[PDB]
């Protein structure tokens, strides 16, 4: 099975996917984020952050309050299982993490922590 996925965040504030499935046979999983828009990071910056469904709100609130210089993520936030950098137009970034950090039966959410974006930019991630 494949253990990577390519995701896009555009100017309309949206991911080209709302659900991800991580095959249990994967040892590591990679996410390739790319920004096909024309707006700069400071106004339409997108990052891909993964946490349990329960931790999402907390991560989003503290992240938005941390500012652009911190890529909108409270430093040393242990709730973030994995995440890419905040990218602007024409930029791209990848993250690879150990699938052992995921458990079956648990509910995970991926989302962008740029002020207000998680309202639309979010989706589910499951270990099947």
Ligand X SMILES: *C1=CC(=O)N(COCN2C(=O)C=C(*)C2=O)C1=O
* Interface residue list for Ni ion (CB under 5 A): 1
Q: Which among Ni ion, Cu ion, ligand X, none contacts residue 40 (Cβ within 5 to 8 A by kind)?
A: ligand X
Asked if 62 interacts with a copy of itself (CB under 8 A), we say no
Six-digit token string for 108: 């995970």
Taking alpha carbons only, the member of 4, 17, 5 closest to residue 111 is 17
Smallest gap from residue 43 Cβ to a copy of itself (A): 5
Site for Cu ion in 94-113 (CB under 5 A): 112
Rg (CA), the chain: 14
83 marked as part of a ligand binding site: no
CB 48 within 8 A of CB 5: no
Q: Which helix or strand (DSSP H or E) is residue 41 part of?
A: helix 41-44
Smallest gap from residue 29 Cβ to Ni ion (A): 10
42 marked as part of a ligand binding site: no
35 marked as part of a ligand binding site: no
Asked if 114 interacts with Cu ion (CB under 5 A), we say yes
Q: Within 13 Å of residue 2, how many CA atoms lie on the same side as its CB?
A: 7
Interaction mask 33-62, ligand X, x per CB under 6 A: -------x-x--------------------
Nearer to ligand X, 68 or 120 (CB): 68
Q: Is 30 exposed, middle or buried (0-12, 13-18, 19+ CB in 10 A)?
A: middle
């Amino acid at each position: 099975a494949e253990c990577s996925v390519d995701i896009q965040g555009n100017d309309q504030m949206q991911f080209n996917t709302n659900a991800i499935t991580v095959d249990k046979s994967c040892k590591q999983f990679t996410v390739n984020l790319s920004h096909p828009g024309n707006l700069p990071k400071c106004v339409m910056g997108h990052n891909w952050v993964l946490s349990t469904a329960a931790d999402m709100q907390g991560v989003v609130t503290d992240g938005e309050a941390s500012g652009l210089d911190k890529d909108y993520l409270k430093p040393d936030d242990s709730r973030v299982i994995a995440h890419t950098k905040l990218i602007g137009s024409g930029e791209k970034d990848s993250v690879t993490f150990d699938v052992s950090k995921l458990k079956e039966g648990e509910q995970y959410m991926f989302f962008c922590t740029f002020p207000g974006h998680s309202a639309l930019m979010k989706g589910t991630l499951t270990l099947k």
